[PDB]
Each structure stands twice: as C-alpha cells, then as structure tokens.
Amino acid sequence: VDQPVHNYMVKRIHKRSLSAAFAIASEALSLLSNTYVDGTEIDSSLRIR
Amino acid sequence: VDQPVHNYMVKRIHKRSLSAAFAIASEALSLLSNTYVDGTEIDSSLRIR
C-alpha cells in the first residue's frame, strides 16, 4: 500500500557581470581642464570637438 | 574589456570624358559661307539640302 510523497527542492542564484570600456585622449583632458581660464576663438572649437 | 572604434576613409574623384565626331563637307561650307553673293533658284535648293 502506497502513501503520497512530498518533494522539497531548493536552488541557488548565480552571479555574473558585464564590463564596457571608455577611453579618452590626453589632449581631450587638457582641453577639458580649463576652469574658466581659456576661451579664445580657436581653442573653443577644439574643446567642442 | 573592449572599447569603441571609429573609422575614417577618403575617396577621390576620377576623370573621364566622351567624344563624338561631326563632319561637314567642303561643298557645304562653300554653300553656307557665300556671304551674300548667291541667292538664285538653284543655289537655294542646294543650301537647303
């Protein structure tokens, strides 16, 4: 004679990641570090670029 | 980890041409360049031709 069964299960999460890079040039940092000092009509175009 | 890439290309023009010929006989030149000397009934038909 049989009796009904109960099954008990358990699972565990798995951790992953994503990574994306982002470069910048040396002249880009040099043009982006002004701190309200420059502003001639030739450096502004390079900063905008 | 990978970082985005930009590309720059430059293409130039290339020059070609077309040529087509067109001939006029010397008799037709003598007919067309009378400079107000002809005008009879038989020169007019040759000038029209």
UniProtKB/TrEMBL annotation, chains A, B:
It comes from the Viruses. Signal peptide: none annotated. Transmembrane segments: none annotated. This is Major capsid protein. The gene is ORF40.
